[PDB]
Ligand binder design. Structure first.
Ligand SMILES: CCC[C@@H](C)[C@H]1CC[C@H]2[C@@H]3[C@H](O)C[C@@H]4C[C@H](O)CC[C@]4(C)[C@H]3C[C@H](O)[C@]12C
Ligand SMILES: [Zn+2]
Lengths: 69, 146, 135, 334, 102, 146
């Protein structure tokens, strides 16, 4: 639902790379294979952690029960 | 389980080596498997939880290095020491048997170690596969021991 | 003496089929018409080429707890002047024809068939033996 | 020979052969003087979060023991218990507690004490063995947001709960012991949660120190592994265009063509990830052989941020030595 | 005060003269068993050293040492532990001097 | 059942008996001696299986193998016959070897009163040791096999 804090295989912290990855894709218009390398995700186990991540938290937050929608 | 190693349908063993135990035994008993004393000893401790007493036989290769063949590893697996009573003798064909070059030659002189011969408890020829360690055949090692 | 057999052989074929470290060599004896050898050799420790002459002897002892203990370094032994020493057991004596028998040795799964007149193979006695090979 | 040969279908000579009983010479007895003379350490890079260094003329067992102790035996501090006050987020309490337990904390492990488990909860946590991290984030609608905006960073106030919101709350003598080294997360930009107006998070995390074997959050290293030094032997000279093809079987910096003789030679075998591509082509058969030096390890220890990688390696060596000493000092019960 | 439950000598597997023995060590795994195996096999009197973890659910390690008649297995184990300590000391010294070198 | 539709595997049992009773200092047996040992062991076993007709009296020797006198013990008798035949085959093989090396093949007993080790004109270092190498069946081996 949200980007995991650590890579499952090795243990590198990838939870702090999601916003930067989105910014490099959106602002700098970089391709997906170079933005990963610019963030230090060299091993493929770390690359798949945020390359295949589905950010479902944004979709879940549309149905906020504490505030009219 | 010990009293029912053989099915009553035909008398063949039904409790024997399954997949991933036949492959490892074949790779140990492969003809180009040579182990030094450290690897030999670690393998022997690996099959007995570091409890059984093993009498290390003289190596099959002596002058360049001291190397034990994996068939000697399984000879120690069948009979660990002199106090074990298991002395089994058998001759059997493997699953894939390629007959030798000449019809006059015996079966053990074939290619690809098709024929297994166990005398005393030493495995003098052949590889260990489903025919010798698996189920369904009456010439297997475990059937003979039982 | 300790040496049961001794001869010089000419290799005619090296068959490394389906293996990477063990090759099956065929050899014919020099100055002995009826003596023939078929032997499995670890080719990495003792590289064998075709049409190469090599000396093969069979002995009952290398001397000139119950686990096997290697001999002390510096002790004189029959293995000192050889390049490839194997230990095995003779398990089968069979007849090929009249005046011609075959002896089968198994050095822990590596085989040797030695065929010849039984005058020459009289000293083999179906026991453990050392096979010493040099060039 | 001590070179692990690499073939097209198998890996040969992978086991150590330095012990008496390998041959009649009965050499390679354990001599501490010979090992002291032969062993070598060469550090090639030393940052604040990553160390690269070669251990030379050491056996595989000891290097693997160092790697395993680094991964799962060197203690580190991570959040263990989480007490919740009014977590009104979409993210569940279990998930949030797990994420908070997975953040790395910049805490020296030697400033704490191991928590006694059999003690009851009223006196289990003291000022010597527990670090308290308080988080308190409330999200409200931005009253002066742009009309045409859609970024949650502008439409809302605290829509992103990060790891830097984990404030440190000193308890007792930690007000003086942790004065010059306040407890902050090693990666402050870790996105812990996302909120919308009306939601609130407030919690207290008790952080103790444990080993990586108990849980992966306590492992001080993000990664800690070695690799043998690659070795490329060119048995026959390779000339002309084939050399260019011979260059394409390796990473770009591994080998090069001399300008004079126009033949290929190995430039840097360390860059060679062993892809054994050159073994695919029949023209390079019996012209190049590949191997790895069996007693030449290239450790690459990356820290999680709590403490330096050289400290981690030193602690691993000390832990192995203490294991050996503790086993030596124990009496053998029959 | 000494830890009596740490290392035990399994009576049913040892020899009468103590030449062969098997020791059960609690709260260890491959990271110590492999190092002990490598160090003990460098003893000229040891002809058998091998460790095993009988079950992953049990934090336990059985190590078997069989020697010749020159020394007992207990002496070989103590020598191996001391020698592993010396190896760790040498590695420690070399690493800590190469840190200060650069 | 340990054989191919047979109660016992003769080849493996013979090899087992030969191996576990092996001794280089044990003198081999002449083929008639092997046959005599087999007969001595197997005589009382197949002699207590007397054949009775349907009436309930003894059956004459001229018509022992007729169809109407088939009893429940015949399978046992058949087994013994096969057993003897197998042993006889081994003896026959040894006899053939003694006929191929110039010696005298004693498949049948030489005489009732003849005594002494009758191989005495053949040279001992050439042909006696050769036939001892190729075939050596001891009394312990055949008794253990039976
Ligand atoms: C109670 C345990 C203390 C222990 C963890 C402390 C006390 C002694 C410390 C080492 C020495 O300072 C020498 C070196 C200095 C370098 O700068 C960083 C590495 C270096 C090997 C140190 C690492 C670590 O910091 C040690 C071992
Ligand atoms: Zn990773």
């Amino acid at each position: 639902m949200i980007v995991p804090v650590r890579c499952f295989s090795c243990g590198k912290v990838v939870g702090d790379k999601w916003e930067s990855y989105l910014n490099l894709l959106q602002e700098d218009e970089l391709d997906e294979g170079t933005a990963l390398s610019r963030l230090g995700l060299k091993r493929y186990c770390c690359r798949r952690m945020i390359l295949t991540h589905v950010d479902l938290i944004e979709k879940f937050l549309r149905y906020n029960p504490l505030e009219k929608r | 389980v010990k009293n029912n190693l053989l099915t009553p349908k035909s008398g063949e063993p039904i409790i024997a080596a399954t997949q991933d135990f036949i492959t490892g035994s074949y790779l140990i008993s492969h003809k180009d498997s040579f182990y030094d004393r450290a690897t030999l000893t670690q393998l022997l401790s690996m099959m007995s939880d570091g409890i059984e007493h093993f009498d290390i036989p003289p190596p099959a290769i002596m002058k360049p290095y001291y190397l034990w063949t994996g068939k000697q590893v399984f000879s120690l697996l069948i009979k660990p020491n002199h106090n074990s009573p298991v002395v089994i003798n058998l001759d059997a064909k493997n699953k894939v048997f390629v007959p030798p070059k000449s019809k006059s030659l015996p079966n053990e002189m074939s290619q690809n170690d098709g024929f297994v011969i166990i005398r005393g408890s030493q495995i003098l020829s052949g590889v260990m596969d489903k025919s010798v360690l698996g189920d369904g055949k009456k010439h297997s090692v475990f059937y003979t021991i039982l | 003496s300790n040496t049961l057999f001794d001869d010089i052989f000419q290799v005619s074929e090296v068959d490394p089929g389906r293996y990477n470290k063990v090759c099956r060599i065929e050899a014919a004896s020099t100055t002995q018409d009826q003596c023939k050898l078929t032997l499995d050799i670890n080719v990495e420790l003792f590289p064998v080429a075709a049409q190469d002459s090599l000396t093969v002897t069979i002995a009952s002892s290398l001397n000139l707890t119950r686990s096997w203990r290697p001999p002390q370094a510096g002790d004189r032994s029959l293995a000192d002047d050889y390049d490839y020493v194997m230990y095995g057991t003779a398990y089968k004596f069979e007849e090929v024809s009249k005046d011609l028998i075959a002896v089968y040795y198994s050095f822990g799964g590596l085989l040797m068939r030695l065929e010849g007149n039984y005058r020459n193979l009289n000293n083999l006695k179906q026991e453990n033996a050392y096979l010493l090979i040099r060039r | 020979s001590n070179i692990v040969g690499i073939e097209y279908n198998r890996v040969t000579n992978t086991t150590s052969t330095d012990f008496p009983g390998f041959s009649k010479d009965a050499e390679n007895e354990w001599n501490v003087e010979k090992f002291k003379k032969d062993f070598e350490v060469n550090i090639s890079s030393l940052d604040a979060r990553e160390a690269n260094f070669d251990l030379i003329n050491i056996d595989t067992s000891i290097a693997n023991a160092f790697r395993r102790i680094m991964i799962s035996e060197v203690p580190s501090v991570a959040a263990e218990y989480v007490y919740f006050f009014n977590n009104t987020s979409v993210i569940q309490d279990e998930v949030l507690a797990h994420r908070i337990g997975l953040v790395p904390l910049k805490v020296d492990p030697d400033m704490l004490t191991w928590v006694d488990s059999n003690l009851p909860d009223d006196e289990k946590f003291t000022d010597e063995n527990t670090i308290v991290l308080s988080l308190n984030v409330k999200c409200t609608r931005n009253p002066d947001a742009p009309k045409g905006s859609t970024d949650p960073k502008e439409l809302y106030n605290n829509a992103h709960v990060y790891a830097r919101d984990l404030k440190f709350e000193p308890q007792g003598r930690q007000s003086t012991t942790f004065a010059d080294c306040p407890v902050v997360p090693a990666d402050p930009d870790i996105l812990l949660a996302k909120l919308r107006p009306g939601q609130e998070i407030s919690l207290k995390a008790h952080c103790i120190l444990g080993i990586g074997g108990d849980h992966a959050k306590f492992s001080p290293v993000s990664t800690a592994s070695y690799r043998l030094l690659p070795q490329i032997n060119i048995l026959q000279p390779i000339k002309g265009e084939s050399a260019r093809r011979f260059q394409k079987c390796f990473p770009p910096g591994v080998i090069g063509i001399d300008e004079g003789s126009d033949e290929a030679y190995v430039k840097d075998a360390r860059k060679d990830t062993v892809s054994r591509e050159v073994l695919r082509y029949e023209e390079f058969a019996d012209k190049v052989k590949l191997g790895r030096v069996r007693n030449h390890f290239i450790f690459n220890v990356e820290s999680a941020g709590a403490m330096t990688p050289e400290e981690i390696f030193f602690k691993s060596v000390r832990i192995l030595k203490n294991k050996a000493e503790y086993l030596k000092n124990c009496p053998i019960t029959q | 005060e000494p830890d009596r439950e740490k290392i035990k000598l399994l009576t049913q597997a040892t020899s009468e003269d103590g030449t062969s023995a098997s020791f059960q060590i609690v709260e260890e795994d491959h990271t110590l068993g492999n190092a002990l195996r490598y160090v003990i096999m460098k003893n000229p009197d040891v002809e058998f050293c091998g460790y095993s973890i009988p079950h992953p659910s049990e934090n336990l390690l059985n190590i078997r040492i069989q020697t010749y008649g020159e020394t007992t297995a207990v002496d070989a184990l103590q020598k191996g532990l001391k020698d592993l300590m010396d190896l760790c000391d040498v590695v420690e010294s070399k690493f800590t001097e190469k840190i200060k070198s650069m | 059942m340990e054989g191919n539709a047979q109660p016992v595997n003769f080849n493996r049992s013979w090899d087992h008996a030969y191996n576990i009773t092996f001794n280089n200092q044990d003198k081999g047996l002449l083929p008639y001696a092997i046959m005599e040992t087999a007969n001595e062991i197997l005589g009382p076993l197949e002699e207590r299986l007397v054949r009775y007709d349907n009436s309930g009296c003894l059956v004459k020797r001229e018509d022992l193998n007729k169809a109407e006198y088939v009893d429940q013990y015949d399978a046992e008798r058949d087994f013994y016959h096969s057993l003897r035949e197998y042993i006889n085959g081994k003896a026959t093989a040894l006899a053939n070897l003694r006929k191929s090396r110039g010696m005298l093949g004693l498949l049948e007993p030489p005489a009732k009163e003849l005594q002494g080790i009758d191989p005495d004109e053949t040279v001992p270092d050439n042909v006696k040791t050769s036939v001892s190498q190729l075939y050596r069946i001891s009394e312990k081996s055949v008794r253990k096999f039976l």
